[PDB]
């Protein structure tokens, strides 16, 4: 009751996108990759249960699930979109997960490729002992 605790964890969301030399048979012009990771020398898997990447409905199996690192999707397409990302926690109490609406933008042909990084800080106020242990390992 004397002591209080705030634990902060750093997530990095990002994507790369490059125009293909030749478009696919379906007419997909771009190759892209989206990811969620920790900083260098981090182990976010200690507290991350899974990452869910909600692709545009035009993709087959659009709710892409990554239970183990790396948390990323590699795809080909013709356009960018808002891509909701859910990071689930190895946590018994709330919050169970966090959601980000990720802007998976693609540049036009004749323009340089995309290499974007978006930093996200999470704060857990007075987590459970077990979750605190998990968070601080990352």
């Amino acid at each position: 009751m004397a002591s209080s605790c705030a634990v902060q964890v750093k997530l990095e969301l990002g994507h790369r996108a490059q125009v293909r030399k030749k478009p696919t048979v379906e007419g997909f012009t771009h190759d892209w990759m989206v990811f969620v990771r920790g900083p260098e020398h981090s182990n976010i898997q200690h507290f991350v249960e899974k990452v869910v990447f909600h692709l545009h409905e035009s993709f087959p199996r659009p709710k892409r699930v990554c239970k183990d690192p790396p948390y990323k999707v590699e795809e080909s397409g013709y356009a960018g979109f808002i891509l909701p990302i859910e990071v689930y926690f190895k946590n018994k109490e709330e919050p169970r997960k966090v959601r980000f609406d990720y802007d998976l933008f693609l540049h036009l042909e004749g323009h340089p490729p995309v290499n974007h990084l978006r930093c996200e800080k999470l704060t857990f106020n007075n987590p459970t002992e077990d979750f605190r242990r998990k968070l601080l390992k990352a």
């Binding site: 545009h56 035009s58 397409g77 013709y78 356009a79 960018g80 979109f81 933008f105 540049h107 036009l108």
Partner: peptide, 10 residues
């Protein structure tokens, strides 16, 4: 509908 787009914009 018509969510998929090219360029950053904004």
């Amino acid at each position: 509908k018509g969510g998929k787009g090219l360029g950053k914009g904004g």
